[PDB]
Design a protein around this ligand. Structure first.
Ligand SMILES: O=P(O)(O)OC[C@H]1O[C@H](OP(=O)(O)OP(=O)(O)O)[C@H](O)[C@@H]1O
Ligand SMILES: O=P(O)(O)OC[C@H]1O[C@H](OP(=O)(O)OP(=O)(O)O)[C@H](O)[C@@H]1O
Ligand SMILES: Nc1ccccc1C(=O)O
Ligand SMILES: Nc1ccccc1C(=O)O
Ligand SMILES: Nc1ccccc1C(=O)O
Ligand SMILES: Nc1ccccc1C(=O)O
Ligand SMILES: [Mg+2]
Ligand SMILES: [Mg+2]
Ligand SMILES: [Mg+2]
Ligand SMILES: [Mg+2]
Lengths: 344, 344
């Protein structure tokens, strides 16, 4: 593994082989490459345009260097983020409904591009987002749910923190979070923030050994099932990649006004979700249900998305109680109660 | 002038305005840009493909921060280098011939591309490559020749040294060398290692205020007048850019065996050069004269390249003596004679 040829090869706009990319990623994440070179590598990679092998190679590298736990049967709903609209944390919400019928290993981080990421809303609900691996396995067996905080499950990533911050631009690292579930979940719903990335990340995923991952991109440009119109998805599995185009009306619902799904803080998002669980906010609930519907389809619990949406309706009615039992076992339920009044 | 804005601009592949580039180069060369961003900008600049305005901006910034001496009537023969063949230092040797007819202010540097760059071979002959400005003036008036060591006359350049070395790849600075002659020479034969750059650089030179400068790209793939076939060149003057193709036979000579023009060390190059001066190496001698011939055409001392090659035939005869005179005034003639002895 020579850093120089690698760089020259990227400067010449030549895609790397999977093993090349993985060895490169391993060296970078281990902190064995000078910042000047790490910076050049990431910039060349972005200007060349990352290819599937490089995404696969980097993903495998991070998985191998991360703190792990074994729960392949679990499902994750994390998306790449980056759309920037600041909508309510729908995948975290959706992760709660799913824990009622399947173990859930939700990989996530805090935010900065909206001051309300998956980790922030959980904390605001009273959950203790910092879970040790041994304790994490126990929580999933008892409550069928656990949140895997990325900062803490991928420590080696600190070796690239300075370069990434100093650069201040998007790099290959900004789209790998969802492909590096610390629990090696085989089933997943992964939102991508751009149509272009849909094709690249789905081919990469195809080689990252999932049982079934569904990647989606929804209008007007979010990494979720679209609440206002069309959604473009890729259904990846051992068999291949299936393409699917869907409109929000296919869920047997009318387009939701995106203004009702935007939040301005962690607590506000926490309240939108609890109100949705209480039946006091049908727009947020719908958004949650259309997303959970596709996840249900990924688990093959329903035959189609309409069925998935209907099934999700039964789940959302038991989600507040499920949320209470999850938090009570890892966090402070008094905060959950507070948020409950604050929405009642 | 904000570095992050510059970086995003380059990541988007938008050429910089002349003044933006100059300000950028000034900040980098002054050492006020973080190594991480300096690195990212050099890579982005190269992957985007530097433009005429960027070359011009950088050139102007370097000239401004350079240590200068007065000799515009002088001529330089330095090339951009980077062709990797590891050929004998023909422009340095060709510079010795020219001092026999015009003051020569040779701009040069050491190398790693074989271990035999212009400065390396001069050191092997016994020359004292670090010549202070005041002393550089005397040497030119006396012997009509003086070597301007790039690492000495561009002191601020040591601020971008760590990044350039660490990167270990070609960047914009690798083609700025000859366009930043410390004596502000108005006449010059500038070599280029690729046809593409032959276009880019010629257009840039046109705005760098020369009287006449000829850029050439050798056929085998070197930045010299081709010794085995075609030579592509552009003659830049106040009145415009003239194009001219040329074959090595147009010098009334037969194609030279390129494998006999290849060096493997500093002394190896000195020995070759000396041998040509002793008339013991026609091939190495013929290579020197076709290049010298074109530089003569640039000084308008000949009306065609055949004459220049003829007149160059006269000069080479008196070359060993001129060399001895040069080195004895600024250097160790003892070393020279050892090389003479080794040459035979
Ligand atoms: O900023 P957004 O419009 O929500 O879109 C970014 C991602 O976040 C959503 O869930 P959640 O809020 O739980 O975030 P996460 O998936 O990034 O953890 C969903 O998973 C999206 O893929
Ligand atoms: O690597 P090359 O095939 O020689 O080509 C690079 C340049 O070097 C040659 O002279 P010299 O060897 O003295 O180098 P310099 O001009 O770069 O100082 C000539 O000036 C070329 O323009
Ligand atoms: N978007 C994500 C999904 C899962 C884990 C981490 C991230 C992250 O952005 O750091
Ligand atoms: N940005 C990330 C992507 C993947 C995994 C962890 C991180 C992190 O910041 O900790
Ligand atoms: N090629 C050159 C020509 C003149 C001065 C410096 C250089 C250099 O490469 O540093
Ligand atoms: N490579 C160069 C080009 C121009 C001026 C100085 C240098 C230098 O290396 O010091
Ligand atoms: Mg998400
Ligand atoms: Mg989202
Ligand atoms: Mg040269
Ligand atoms: Mg040359």
């Amino acid at each position: 593994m020579n850093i120089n040829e690698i760089l020259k090869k990227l400067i010449n706009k030549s895609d790397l082989e999977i093993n090349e990319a993985e060895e490169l990623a391993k060296a970078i994440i281990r902190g064995e490459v000078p910042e000047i070179l790490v910076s050049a590598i990431l910039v060349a990679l972005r200007m060349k345009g990352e290819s599937k092998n490089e995404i696969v190679g980097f993903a495998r590298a991070m998985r191998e260097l991360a703190i792990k736990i074994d729960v392949p049967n679990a499902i994750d709903t994390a998306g790449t983020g980056g759309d920037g609209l600041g909508t309510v944390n729908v995948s975290t919400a959706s992760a709660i409904l799913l824990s009622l019928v399947n173990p859930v290993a939700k990989h996530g981080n805090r935010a900065v591009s909206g001051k309300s990421g998956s980790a922030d809303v959980l904390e605001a609900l009273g959950y203790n987002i910092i879970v040790p691996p041994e304790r994490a396995k126990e929580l999933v067996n008892k409550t069928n749910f656990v949140f895997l905080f990325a900062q803490y499950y991928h420590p080696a990533m600190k070796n690239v923190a300075n370069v990434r911050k100093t650069l201040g631009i998007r790099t290959i690292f900004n789209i790998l979070g969802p492909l590096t579930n610390p629990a090696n979940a085989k089933y997943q719903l992964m939102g991508v923030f751009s149509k272009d990335h849909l094709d690249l990340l789905s081919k990469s995923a195809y080689e990252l050994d999932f049982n079934k991952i569904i990647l989606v991109y929804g209008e007007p440009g979010i990494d979720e099932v679209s609440p206002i119109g069309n959604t473009f998805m890729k259904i990846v599995s051992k068999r291949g990649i299936e393409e699917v185009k869907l409109n929000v009306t296919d869920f047997g619902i009318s387009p939701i006004p995106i203004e009702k799904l935007i939040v301005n803080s962690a607590e506000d998002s926490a309240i939108k979700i609890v109100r949705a669980f209480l039946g006091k906010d049908e727009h947020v609930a719908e958004f949650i249900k259309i997303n959970t519907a596709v996840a249900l389809f990924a688990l093959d619990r329903v035959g189609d998305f309409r069925e998935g949406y209907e099934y999700a309706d039964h789940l959302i009615e038991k989600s507040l109680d499920k949320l209470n039992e999850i938090i009570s076992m890892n966090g402070d339920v008094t905060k959950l109660k507070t948020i409950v009044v604050k929405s009642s």
